């Protein structure tokens, strides 16, 4: 009986929740699945023939920037009509209600979809960037960008079905920098597989993890690093961590609680 296996007791989690002064909520793509945004775990991890982790890499962008921009353009256009779900709303409303009591809630998200922002979350660390920002590969400037389509050559492009032909847009016609007449090639302002997360963001993440007294880890596979090690760091300080996922993960047995099921059902219950 010694070995702790995670608890499924909602009442015991809610006893910690009632007292918690600083809650960190870490989210991955599962928190947006109920808005109609597929995760990359299964069939939704394919775009044409490629797996998503093979397109979100600086080697794909260096050698076929038109293909990587078609994939991000597809995602931007699909995301424009997507709405926050009950999970994103519970998260946002929890922050607002606890903030009035002087209690802190912060969201550390792997997602680039901005749906936590749309839901009303204020304290948000977007650790992998944003679908709706660009970064210039020449001058480094980061800009918000919601334009549909981002550039004329991408109009009508990005269809996801296997067998769709590549647009093969010449690099000069991909999104270009307009800042002080720079003209450089833009990329998505998204952290890709093989790249370093921003140091300033990581320092803020470390501060929140070190100071929190309760952590939720929601809709993440806990196999994407370094994010996968955030909630185990909190658990190993002896702070309760509650995982909300439709399945178990490689990190589940490190945590105090595991609440199995769709987070749009379990989050409103846990955060009421």
């Amino acid at each position: 009986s010694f070995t702790a296996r995670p608890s499924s007791s909602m009442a015991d989690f809610r006893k910690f929740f009632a007292k918690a002064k600083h809650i960190v909520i870490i989210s991955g793509a599962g928190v947006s699945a109920e808005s109609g945004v597929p995760t990359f775990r299964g069939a939704g991890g394919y775009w044409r023939k490629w797996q998503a982790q093979d397109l979100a890499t600086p080697l794909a962008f260096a050698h076929n920037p038109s293909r990587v921009w078609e994939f991000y353009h597809y995602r931007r256009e699909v995301m424009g009509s997507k709405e926050p779900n009950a999970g994103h709303r519970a998260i946002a409303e929890c922050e607002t209600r606890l903030g009035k009591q002087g209690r802190r809630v912060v969201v550390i998200t792997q997602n680039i979809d901005e749906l936590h922002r749309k839901a009303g979350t204020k304290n948000l660390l977007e650790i992998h960037g944003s679908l709706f920002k660009t970064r210039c590969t020449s001058c480094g400037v980061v800009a918000e960008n919601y334009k549909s389509p981002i550039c004329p050559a991408l109009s009508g492009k990005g269809a996801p079905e296997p067998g769709t032909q590549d647009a093969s847009i010449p690099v000069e016609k991909l999104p270009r920098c307009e800042e002080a007449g720079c003209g450089g090639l833009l990329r998505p302002h998204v952290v890709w597989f093989g790249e370093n997360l921003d140091p300033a963001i990581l320092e803020e993440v470390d501060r929140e993890l070190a100071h929190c007294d309760l952590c939720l880890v929601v809709g993440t596979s806990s196999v994407v690093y370094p994010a996968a090690m955030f909630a185990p760091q909190v658990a190993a300080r002896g702070v309760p961590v509650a995982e909300f996922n439709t399945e178990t993960t490689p990190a589940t047995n490190r945590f105090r609680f595991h609440f199995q099921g769709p987070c749009g059902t379990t989050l409103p219950e846990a955060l009421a």
Binding site: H128, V191, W192, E195, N196, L197, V223, V224, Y225
Partner: peptide, 8 residues
């Protein structure tokens, strides 16, 4: 450990 990767 600042570099993004997949485990397993």
């Amino acid at each position: 450990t600042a570099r993004k990767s997949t485990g397993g």
